[PDB]
């Protein structure tokens, strides 16, 4: 009888997560792009101004499907998120739901940082241990649990 | 702010409120009636540790400060906003850990 | 392992040495004394 | 055994002096004992032991010079 308890991924400390070297990989998602636009900050230069390090953004196919699905009010968001500076993942699961796609994607790798803004996703991300989220705030970004913010 | 602008106010104790409380180290045992001098009024202060309640007796020129509960307790009374921090020149924390000596 | 020590089963292999017998006698005697 | 070594020597006949910087190197002793230093410096120059003067000493950290 096969039980399955996932081991704590061995590039993690107690909660320090030494696998997050300063060239970062972030996970952009949908209402974070929308709030970045309606707070009028940029994306790559905004992340650089918040983290003082070179950040590579990533968007998944599930989040791109959500951004296409949300209609023509966010054509600015879609034109911004088809940026050649960002990269793109490729998901393989059923149901384009950004929340469980994101939190599954990060809890089986523990190396991405999650750039989110909605309440349930922030709650699940800060529930699971040792991955940093960032969010919009005022006219800049804000990091929640990176060990070296400065 | 809770008394004009100052954070601390010298005061005169009227009487040890609740000496006849039978349960030792209780809320109604650990109160004193302080006459605030800055505007001449009554207030009920909350000296910690009934074993060190009995340093202050009567017009011991006591110095109050706020209390600020960091939660909710079992049988603590509300209404007391003031704790004793210094009595007659010395600090009663230092008196209770018996470093200094109360002068008279 | 030496040829005079390769016993027919691991029970006699565990009986064949000394430190395990020492620990077993003192631990078993302490257990009987604790039960009484 | 100690040594002394002068550097940055400039003549100055406006006072008929020679002024310089003095590096004394003592491997294990404490310091170079200014009177004995003064007679040694007047010996290596042509001076008096009365016409030679040294004042601004400081032993650098860790000892030795």
């Amino acid at each position: 009888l096969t039980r399955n308890i996932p081991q704590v991924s061995s590039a993690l400390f107690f909660q320090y997560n030494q696998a997050i070297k300063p060239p970062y990989q972030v996970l952009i998602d949908t209402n974070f792009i929308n709030f970045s636009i309606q707070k009028k900050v940029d994306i790559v230069r905004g992340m650089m101004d918040c983290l003082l390090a070179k950040c590579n953004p990533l968007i998944t196919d599930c989040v791109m499907a959500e951004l296409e699905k949300l209609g023509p009010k966010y054509r600015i968001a879609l034109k911004l998120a088809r940026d050649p500076r960002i990269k793109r993942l490729s998901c393989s699961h059923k149901g384009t739901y950004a929340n469980d796609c994101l939190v599954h994607r990060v809890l089986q790798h523990k190396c991405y940082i999650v750039a989110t803004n909605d309440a349930g996703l922030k709650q699940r991300i800060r529930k699971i241990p040792g991955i940093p989220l960032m969010s919009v705030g005022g006219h800049a970004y804000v990091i929640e649990k990176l060990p070296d913010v400065f | 702010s809770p008394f004009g602008g100052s954070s601390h106010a010298k005061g005169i104790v009227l009487e040890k409120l609740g000496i006849e409380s039978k349960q030792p180290n209780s809320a109604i045992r650990k109160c004193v009636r302080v006459q605030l001098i800055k505007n001449g009024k009554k207030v009920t202060a909350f000296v910690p540790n009934d074993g060190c309640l009995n340093f202050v007796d009567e017009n011991d020129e006591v110095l109050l400060a706020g209390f600020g509960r960091k939660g909710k307790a079992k049988g603590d009374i509300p209404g007391v906003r003031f704790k004793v921090v210094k009595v007659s020149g010395v600090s009663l924390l230092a008196l209770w850990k018996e470093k200094k000596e109360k002068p008279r | 392992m030496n040829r005079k020590e390769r016993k027919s089963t691991i029970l006699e292999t565990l009986m064949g040495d000394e430190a395990s017998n020492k620990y077993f006698k003192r631990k078993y005697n302490e257990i009987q004394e604790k039960s009484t | 055994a100690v040594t002394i070594r002068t550097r940055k020597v400039i003549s100055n006949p406006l006072l008929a002096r020679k002024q310089f910087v003095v590096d004394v190197l003592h491997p294990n002793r404490a310091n170079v004992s200014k009177d004995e230093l003064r007679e040694k410096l007047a010996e290596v120059y042509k001076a008096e032991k009365d016409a030679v003067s040294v004042f601004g000493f400081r032993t650098q950290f860790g000892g030795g010079k």
Partner: protein, 174 residues
């Protein structure tokens, strides 16, 4: 002056485990040492961010970035191949505080542990060439990395033996 700065929050789980791991790994005294090294790292790469966000071929970016990388390769936290400005952006606190004299003499050998390294170089034994250094937080430059040896006026080098050894030699030769 005010070198060290308090972080954006000092009571947090990930920060607490960060200071625990760094302190117990590089043999550190308190949080002020990590905060000083972290502060000056943050200051130099905050200065590097502006030189990045302005354009190339500006004389400011050109010779100020050359000045910054010359200073950082002189300290030694940047390798000889990555001599361009965004690796300064990709710097990290670990290979920046690794060049302190405590960790550096432990890596050089001659100490058998980081804590023994710290207690001997504060017991005044290790001299970089000629100068006896009695302080840990040195950030030894790259050129003087091979001049680390026991100082000659210290009984792990070749001086007279210490007071414990010669007192025991006296009252064991009696």
């Amino acid at each position: 002056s005010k070198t060290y700065s308090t972080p954006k929050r000092p009571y947090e789980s990930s920060r607490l485990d960060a200071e625990l791991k760094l302190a117990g790994e590089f043999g550190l005294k308190n949080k002020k040492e990590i905060y000083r090294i972290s502060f000056q790292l943050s200051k130099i790469r905050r200065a590097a961010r502006d030189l990045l966000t302005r354009d190339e071929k500006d004389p400011k970016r050109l010779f100020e970035g050359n000045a910054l990388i010359r200073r950082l390769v002189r300290v030694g936290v940047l390798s000889e191949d990555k001599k361009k400005l965004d690796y300064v952006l990709a710097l990290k606190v670990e290979d920046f505080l690794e060049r302190r004299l405590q960790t550096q003499v432990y890596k050089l050998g001659l100490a058998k542990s980081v804590h023994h390294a710290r207690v001997l170089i504060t017991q005044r034994h290790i001299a970089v060439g000629k100068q006896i250094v009695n302080i840990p937080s040195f950030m030894v430059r790259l050129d003087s990395e091979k001049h680390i040896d026991f100082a000659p006026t210290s009984p792990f080098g070749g001086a007279r033996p210490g007071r414990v050894a010669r007192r025991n030699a006296a009252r064991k030769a009696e």
